[PDB]
């Protein structure tokens, strides 16, 4: 059974249960199957990981795992204990087992252990017991596997979870050789690609990693991940992963934007790709998303378009790429600024006009997005669309003036001073 | 430390 | 009565009821009295001002207006029909009344009409019936004041609601002239200062406006508003406002940060400045607020002191923020010096440490217990935390230059070395 | 300032 779905795997506010239930409706509607529970900053997933769910939280989680079953979505409960765990103390281990059990008794049939973004060293007690860092994860992992009874899905996220993160390189890695050889052939290995946010996940590279770990990996994809930049949102199509990768992979679990309602394209298209042109796949997704907008019902006395959503997506597209309308406006503004010294030049004025109208459409897009019925959708994207429309007003002004002191605040001030911006 | 992606 | 507390008046995601109830609590706990309901993007407050609250909506408004009365907080409900209302048409007025009626029936005694941020012109029908735009606004506000039975508190935010916005100046403007003379003296008037978000409210200016509106205004205070700037958050003391104002004003309602749990300092300190003069020290207030706040969150006072200084006020960083900036501007300026330069090294060590503190603050905030407070500030705290890493590591780099000529970026990056996305790119081309 |  190939795994395809979403991993709620990001830093910041986690999604509420009413949202996660909505996630399950959609995943089923788009014929996806998995959900990997892993929100870095949900209390007892990581920081206070040993601590057992209160009876009121135990109620909410059991209701969630049930809803997962209701919608034929497999629920994989992951735990990230690697911050401050002593790998050899059996009180640690017995507090892990006891927690996993607590979840097991909510329904949960599938699990995961995540050792990502943690110190490569370990305390002196464990220096004694295990030879390398790998060996200590492999050991506590393999035990917890057998303890729970070898469930059908069990996932392990390595510390060297992408190509750049392997020392010295992907193939000849002490750490990855130890995982490959000694991790029980039943459990699965997560992998984000060349880089943490891989622009491309090429086939060669998945073979280069599949050898060293003795198995086909499950992609934790951060293509649509947002947590790393307060001004970035990603609404462009799933892209840079060949459909040829499917024969060489056990899954793809996309770690998407923090804002729930902002992930309709990222997941719609992943499911399209699961059955590929990303330009086509977007249109399919934008066209279908548009119906979720609507305009409030009225018993008394301008509605968002497909051309609006195409512009929204193009301005908040992908990590390594702006959408076409975004790229174009940015080209046209670069040409207008650099040719401002020509004020025969009817060209500048005819292209000024066209860009001022391009700017106008961004303002129109926010006006209409503001008047829509789905306020959940509006609130989740508000501060993003606000920003784009206000920079565009400032840019519309500035172009006309050829014919923000504290902006960003302290962060912004320091950032302008770095010479790489 | 820092311990992040 | 002198009105003093919070206007939920910002653009974007409004607060949910259980947030608004926890606010009423705090307004009482710190001896504040009023709450103006005017969140720009609760659709029935403005864009669909004509629309009656539904059944399930009604229960919420009613249960809210309850918790306000229970906590002796004075609920003012606002409505902003400014955009698309035809002022001259009787059926349009009837809707406005009918809706105000509907809310009256939830409990609401106090009301408000806002006419901020709208086109200064009006339609065909209004040009006939009304001599000026100002005449139109005062007419329907009067008619509505009298229809509701003339309640104790009833506000009017004008279109020209700050100094910068009066054509041509404050005293010489037809608009504010018309409002002073023709607008019923039982109606109060909202004012934000010389500007929309004011650095200082000088007493001289509040007199200059007191005369032309013919009364003591109520201040909508945008000082801690953060709805205009995605990267900005304001945890600074209530400041730039003279206690000497109190006597000359009918109130001060602070329009604060969208993130609810980050308004503790913003309101707590407004409380100490109301209480002090029913003089006052912004630096003291802050220390009181930050010590008290800390009970709610392992996170230290120094951590919060730093935090508040990093995210201080619209026109001013805090001491530890401003000094970190000075040093980094000095360190990069005098970096061409890689005897006589033991100074740069020993200061680059002082700096790399103060960066280490911002990292530690974040570790400790993320291990904290109060997750409501963590989540409301997470993206703000992660941003500074992470800009500081790139800064600390760039000072490091300038140092290890004596014995290297590697680039500052090692080859091909992760995305978060090139920030801001499209918006960010456009912005770095404005001069 | 910046804006409203
Ligand atoms: C690494 O970075 C991504 C995006 O910053 C973050 O969501 C994720 O939690 C971290 N772990 C993995 C496997 O990506
Ligand atoms: C003006 O701008 C402030 C902050 O941008 C916003 O909160 C406020 O709602 C707008 N209107 C008025 C009257 O202040």
Q: What is the 3-state secondary structure (H, E, C) of A4-67?
A: EEEEECCCCCCCCHHHHHHHHHHHHHCCCCEEEECCCCCHHHHCCCCCCCCHHHHHHHHHHHHH
CB contact under 8 A, A379 and C12: yes
Taking only Cα atoms into account, the Rg of chain A, rounded to an integer number of angstroms, comes to 24
Q: How far is A280 from chain D (nearest CA, A)?
A: 39
What is the rounded distance in angstroms from the CA atom of residue C70 to the CA atom of residue A393? 45
Which H/E stretch holds residue C5? strand C3-8
Residue A150, judged by CB atoms within 10 A of its CB (0-12, 13-18, 19+), counts as exposed
> In terms of DSSP bridges, do strands A34-37 and A74-79 run parallel, antiparallel, or are they unpaired?
parallel
Residue A295, judged by CB atoms within 10 A of its CB (0-12, 13-18, 19+), counts as middle
Resolution, angstroms, 1 dp: 2.9
Sort out which chain A residues have CB atoms less than 8 A from C260's CB and list them: none
CB contact under 8 A, B3 and A11: no
The CATH fold assigned to C1-281 is TIM Barrel (3.20.20)
Question: Could you say which DSSP state residue A223 is in?
Answer: T
Angle at A200 between CA A194 and CA A206, to 5 degrees: 55
State whether the Cα torsion C134-A371-A318-A219 is positive or negative: positive
Under a CB-based contact definition with an 8 Å cutoff, are residues A252 and A225 in contact?
no
Q: What is residue C274's three-state secondary structure?
A: helix
Question: Which residue is closest in CA terms to ligand 2's atom 5?
Answer: D4
Tell me the ligand closest to A226's alpha carbon: 1
Helix, strand counts (H, E) of chain B: 0, 0
Q: Nearest-CA neighbor of A231 among A384, A413, A385?
A: A384
| Residues facing A66 on adjacent strands | none
Q: How far is B2 from chain C (nearest CA, A)?
A: 7
Tell me the ligand closest to C224's alpha carbon: 2
CA distances from B3 to A83, A194, C139 (A): 8, 20, 62
Q: Which residues contact A234 (CB under 8 A, 6 or more apart)?
A: A223, A224, A225, A226, A256, A257, A266, A316, A317, A318, A319
| Phi, psi of A300, rounded to the nearest 5 degrees | -175, -170
For a ligand 2 pocket test, name from C13, C117, C219 the mutation site with the most ligand atoms within 8 angstroms of its C-beta.
C117
| Residues facing C110 on adjacent strands | C76
What is the rounded distance in angstroms from the CA atom of residue C365 to the CA atom of residue A153? 34
What is the rounded distance in angstroms from the CA atom of residue C320 to the CA atom of residue C323? 5
Q: How far is A330 from chain C (nearest CA, A)?
A: 7
CA distances from A78 to A21, A44, A53, A157 (A): 18, 11, 14, 10
Under a CB-based contact definition with an 8 Å cutoff, are residues A255 and A218 in contact?
no
Helix/strand/coil percentages in chain C, nearest 5: 50, 10, 40
CA distances from C57 to C42, C80, C103 (A): 11, 18, 11
State whether the Cα torsion A385-A391-A392-A393 is positive or negative: positive
Question: Could you say which DSSP state residue C236 is in?
Answer: P
Which ranges of C278-342 would DSSP assign to H, the alpha helix?
282-295, 301-310, 319-333
For residue C364, how far is the Cα from the chain centroid?
A: 27
Q: How far is the CA of C89 from the centre of ligand 2 (A)?
A: 28
Under a CB-based contact definition with an 8 Å cutoff, are residues A38 and A9 in contact?
yes
What is the rounded distance in angstroms from the CA atom of residue A44 to the CA atom of residue A368? 40
Sort out which chain B residues have CB atoms less than 8 A from C359's CB and list them: 2
Taking only Cα atoms into account, the Rg of chain B, rounded to an integer number of angstroms, comes to 4
Sort out which chain D residues have CB atoms less than 8 A from C165's CB and list them: none
Size of interface A-C (CB pairs under 8 A): 159
Taking only Cα atoms into account, the Rg of chain D, rounded to an integer number of angstroms, comes to 4
What is the rounded distance in angstroms from the CA atom of residue C147 to the CA atom of residue A127? 81
Q: Does D2 touch chain A (CB under 8 A)?
A: yes
What is the rounded distance in angstroms from the CA atom of residue A282 to the CA atom of residue A310? 9
Helix/strand/coil percentages in chain B, nearest 5: 0, 0, 100
Q: How far is the CA of C11 from the centre of ligand 2 (A)?
A: 7
Domain A1-277: give its CATH superfamily. Answer: Glycosidases (3.20.20.80)
Q: What is residue A257's three-state secondary structure?
A: coil
Where in chain C are the domains?
1-281, 282-431
Question: Could you say which DSSP state residue A197 is in?
Answer: S
Sort out which chain B residues have CB atoms less than 8 A from A117's CB and list them: 3-5
Q: How far is the CA of A416 from the centre of ligand 2 (A)?
A: 27
Q: How far is the CA of C218 from the centre of ligand 2 (A)?
A: 15
Question: Which residue is closest in CA terms to ligand 1's atom 3?
Answer: B5
D in contact with B (at least 3 C-beta pairs within 8 A): no
What is the rounded distance in angstroms from the CA atom of residue A203 to the CA atom of residue A248? 8
For residue A157, how far is the Cα from the chain centroid?
A: 16
**Axis crossing angle, helix A133-148 with helix A90-104, rounded to the nearest 10:** 40
What is the rounded distance in angstroms from the CA atom of residue A336 to the CA atom of residue A330? 10
CB contact under 8 A, B4 and A11: yes
B in contact with A (at least 3 C-beta pairs within 8 A): yes
Which ranges of C195-337 would DSSP assign to H, the alpha helix?
203-212, 264-275, 282-295, 301-310, 319-333
What is the rounded distance in angstroms from the CA atom of residue C173 to the CA atom of residue C414? 55
Which partners does chain B have (≥3 C-beta pairs < 8 Å)? A, C
Which residues sit directly before a break in chain C (C to N > 2.5 Å)? 278, 297, 338
Q: Nearest-CA neighbor of C137 among C97, C191, C100, C82?
A: C82
């Amino acid at each position: 059974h190939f795994l395809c779905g979403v991993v709620e795997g990001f830093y910041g506010r986690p999604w509420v249960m009413e949202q996660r239930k909505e996630l399950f409706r959609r995943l089923q509607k788009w014929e996806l199957n998995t959900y990997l529970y892993a929100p870095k900053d949900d209390y007892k997933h990581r920081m206070f990981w040993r601590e057992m769910y209160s009876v009121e939280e135990a109620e909410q989680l059991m209701t969630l795992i049930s809803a997962a079953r209701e919608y034929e979505i497999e629920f994989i409960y992951a735990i990230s204990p690697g911050l401050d765990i002593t790998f050899s103390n059996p009180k640690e281990v017995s507090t892990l087992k006891r927690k996993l059990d607590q979840v097991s008794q909510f329904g949960c049939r599938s699990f995961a252990l995540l050792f990502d973004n943690i110190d490569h060293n370990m305390c002196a007690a464990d220096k004694e017991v295990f030879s390398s860092f790998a060996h200590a994860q492999v050991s506590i992992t393999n035990e917890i596997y057998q303890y729970l009874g070898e469930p059908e899905t069990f996932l392990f996220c390595p510390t060297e979870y992408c190509g750049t993160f392997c020392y010295p390189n992907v193939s000849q890695s002490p750490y990855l050789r130890t995982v490959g050889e000694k991790l029980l052939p039943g459990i699965e290995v997560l992998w984000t690609g060349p880089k943490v946010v891989s622009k491309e996940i090429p086939v060669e590279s998945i073979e280069e990693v599949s050898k060293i770990i003795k198995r086909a990996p499950v992609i934790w994809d951060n293509i649509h991940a947002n947590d790393y930049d307060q001004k970035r949102l990603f609404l462009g199509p799933y892209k840079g992963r060949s459909t040829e990768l499917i024969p060489r992979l056990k899954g793809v679990l996309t770690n998407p934007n923090c804002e729930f309602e902002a992930n309709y394209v990222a997941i719609h298209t992943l499911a399209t790709w699961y059955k590929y042109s990303p330009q086509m796949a977007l249109k399919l997704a934008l066209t279908e998303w548009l119906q979720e907008f609507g305009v409030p019902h009225q018993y008394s006395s301008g509605s968002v378009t497909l051309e609006d959503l195409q512009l929204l997506a193009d301005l908040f597209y992908l990590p390594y790429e702006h959408g076409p309308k975004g790229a174009q406006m940015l080209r046209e503004f670069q040409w207008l600024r650099a040719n401002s010294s020509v004020v025969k030049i009817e060209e500048w004025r005819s292209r000024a006009a066209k860009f001022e109208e391009m700017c106008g459409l961004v303002m129109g897009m926010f006006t209409r997005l503001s008047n829509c019925a789905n306020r959940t959708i509006l609130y989740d994207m508000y501060s993003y669309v606000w920003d784009i429309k206000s920079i565009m007003s400032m840019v519309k002004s500035f172009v006309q003036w050829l014919g923000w002191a504290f902006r960003g605040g302290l962060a912004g001030e320091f950032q302008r001073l770095l010479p790489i911006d | 430390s820092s311990r992040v992606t």
